[PDB]
Design a protein around this ligand. Sequence first.
Ligand SMILES: Nc1ncnc2c1ncn2[C@@H]1O[C@H](CSCC[C@H](N)C(=O)O)[C@@H](O)[C@H]1O
Length: 327
Amino acid sequence: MIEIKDKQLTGLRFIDLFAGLGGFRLALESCGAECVYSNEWDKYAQEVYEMNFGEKPEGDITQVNEKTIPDHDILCAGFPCQAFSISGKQKGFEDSRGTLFFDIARIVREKKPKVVFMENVKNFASHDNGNTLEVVKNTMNELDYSFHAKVLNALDYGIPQKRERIYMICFRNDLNIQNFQFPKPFELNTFVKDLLLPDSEVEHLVIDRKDLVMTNQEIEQTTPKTVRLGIVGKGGQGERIYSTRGIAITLSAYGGGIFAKTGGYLVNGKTRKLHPRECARVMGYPDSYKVHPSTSQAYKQFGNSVVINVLQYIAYNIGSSLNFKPY
DNA sequence: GATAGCGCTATC
DNA sequence: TGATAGCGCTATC
Ligand SMILES: Nc1ncnc2c1ncn2[C@@H]1O[C@H](CSCC[C@H](N)C(=O)O)[C@@H](O)[C@H]1O
């Protein structure tokens, strides 16, 4: 994550829905905002969240009375994506976990915040011939909000990871906000190698498999893209090996394969998956952030989380627009 | 709860 | 295309 000198959200309160690790909180608080409520139902996530922020998020949002939610200016929500991701069954709203957006919609109806800040995977944008994104657009447009939606790739914002996500920013219409803009991409000068831990600390992650097959020579020059070097087994998800000179593939939450949830990398002649700390770094989390004691849950947590830096630039731009009120 | 082989969709 | 990559699925212990 980045240092923010000009706090654009000072004095504003926000809600951290589907909190997970608290990525949205880190991003918004770094801009000067105050979190007044958090919600997350996974026991392990609640444990890490509490370990880092001192509070336990409230449980199952589907059974929380919206009138109970504290007044706030900004609603944050990286809602579930299993139902829309290119990696899943794409059941959408018909999935037991694909209707969470409507829980957001009904919170917005009751609390009517100044801004609604949501996040989800890239495929959400095209899922079901684009009908799902339109349902969200109309739902917000009808709750009386504008709808700014764009797909940003983390590699365009200082973080070496090919994580493409759709970011949705909605302003209450009375706040005639007509100058919101998504952050402008800039050159990437940090790569996977720059974030790795010393070999002594990751020896246990090294995998040596007879069916390891290198298909491409290691690259000498850093590039802002993923570069596959080899594969293990059939080369399905989590069986692919990349160059640390390029960028990291998308970390996942339920991912399988020998290099489950992080993918494999060629480091000093050895192939290994990333350490939870490196995942934290690949996601833009500061080293001060405490990871969960269960490595598997830690990978899962960072897996469906958000890249803090991207959130920061957007959050900064949200406050910039909110603060431009000339006479 | 942790581990890992998979198998199919989206993109150009 | 043909090659690549995905906040996933889920069987087993
Ligand atoms: N009904 C429900 N109530 C509360 N949390 C829920 C929920 N259904 C799903 N979730 C939570 O939705 C989250 C989606 S992942 C969002 C990650 C988050 N922005 C971060 O930075 O970590 C998961 O952590 C999941 O446990």
